[PDB]
Ligand binder design. Sequence first.
Ligand SMILES: CC(C)C1=C(C(=O)O)[C@](C)(C[C@H]2[C@H]([C@@H](C)C=O)CC[C@H]2C)C=C1
Ligand SMILES: CC(C)C1=C(C(=O)O)[C@](C)(C[C@H]2[C@H]([C@@H](C)C=O)CC[C@H]2C)C=C1
Lengths: 133, 134
Amino acid sequence: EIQTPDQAEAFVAKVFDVLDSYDYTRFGEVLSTDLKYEGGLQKTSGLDNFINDIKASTQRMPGLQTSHSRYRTELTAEGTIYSEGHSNASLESNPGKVVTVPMIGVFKLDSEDGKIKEMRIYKDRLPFLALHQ
Amino acid sequence: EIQTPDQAEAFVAKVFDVLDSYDYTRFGEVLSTDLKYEGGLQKTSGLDNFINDIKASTQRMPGLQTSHSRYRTELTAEGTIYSEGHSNASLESNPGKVVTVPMIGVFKLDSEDGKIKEMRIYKDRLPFLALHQA
Ligand SMILES: CC(C)C1=C(C(=O)O)[C@](C)(C[C@H]2[C@H]([C@@H](C)C=O)CC[C@H]2C)C=C1
Ligand SMILES: CC(C)C1=C(C(=O)O)[C@](C)(C[C@H]2[C@H]([C@@H](C)C=O)CC[C@H]2C)C=C1
């Protein structure tokens, strides 16, 4: 399935395309039922727990929009995907105010179906405070 | 010379041993003079610029103390070191208030002398605001 860095990067792109849509009914297309997720101090086990965690943060930030880009992905001999890129966010209240930070995603895939079973996203959230005027 | 993940991880531990001492005269033992560093929106080119960036940031937080641990390191076929661990910080004024966040370091080494020529550190700094409060 995923054999090259380019295919890994395209998969990560597809994953964030789903995630940034906030269409939770599709998250299971790409995330395993027992997903282990860490995002700084946010940590969840299982797909429903992942979805509930995002929903909570999203109610906290109404009007939130996010997007992601990638520029450097490796696919290692252990099967790990390391993907460096950037994370963008804006608030619908002032959508022209965009905050962008570097990010890296660490992914391990399910050997059976190729879904993400471990996802650890690293980025500095402090700059997103600038979304509040 | 680094050929295994365990040696990669042991080297990263020593690197942060030097960095967390804030003894800037030693940074060149492990960092190349043309080091390319990115730490969130912090970005520097050259060792002197890296050092000045840290010095500026430390002036903002007197009494800062830091340490690091590691748990999962890979050394790839491209020579890249990816090292996941944690970043701890406290203030000397209140040393028992510790804030710890996950972190990962991305490193490329100088083929000549084995020093770090690229270092990109990723972590959420927002929790460290709790070091001002109480
Ligand atoms: C302030 C930032 C921009 C923020 C996110 C975060 O930093 O946790 C969340 C809580 C979740 C992100 C997800 C995680 C897995 C990020 O990669 C994917 C996209 C978005 C739903 C949404 C906005
Ligand atoms: C608030 C946080 C904890 C903080 C750091 C940071 O987040 O930039 C700096 C500015 C620099 C770090 C260095 C960079 C390369 C971090 O990895 C190494 C250790 C410390 C000297 C010091 C404390």
